[PDB]
Amino acid sequence: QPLLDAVLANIRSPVFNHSLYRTFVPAMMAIHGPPIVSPVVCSRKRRFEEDERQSIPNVLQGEVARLDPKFLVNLDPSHCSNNGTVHLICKLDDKDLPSVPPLELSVPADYPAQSPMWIDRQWQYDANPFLQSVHRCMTSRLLQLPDKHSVTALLNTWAQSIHQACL
């Protein structure tokens, strides 16, 4: 019903938003008397210094912290520092049979991709027939993985293919 104040606020185009002060605050401070509605001091520096500057994007850090201790990830030659951010050089040190460490180079944390790249595979897989079967199984599983993810999905599929294709 009181659209008059609405059309008046619409009229309030000029920059001098101080006439409303003299218009309203006299009666407001008269009938309401909280001159200090917040006498608590408020002086904090918003941005002094806050940055990691000493590691990779911590997203993959928090991800890899969840994985099973049977996966041992290390650091490769420095080519995945910030943008690529991942050189998944992992060892499956556990009670199961060991194998060749995967590469699994994923992309920036935006994740418009996954990890499996398999650079050093060309000679690591075709040499051993059993490892060749392992690679075949791992490829067939990865192709059936809809939009696999950085560390969890890739490493899980790799381990399950390695310990399923034993036969």
Partner: protein, 48 residues
């Protein structure tokens, strides 16, 4: 429902009292309601 008063504390210990039937202008009119003139409340409080 008669002879309203209004006390309120703002500062570290300052609590002001006023008669709530004046409407910030006593000589003009009244609040059309509760009866005004609680009496000599000023000196009653100034006792202490």
């Amino acid at each position: 429902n008669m002879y309203c008063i209004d006390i309120y504390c703002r500062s570290r210990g300052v609590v002001a009292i006023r008669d709530g039937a004046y409407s910030l202008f006593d000589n003009s009119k009244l609040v059309e309601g509760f009866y005004p003139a609680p009496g000599l409340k000023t000196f009653l409080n100034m006792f202490v």
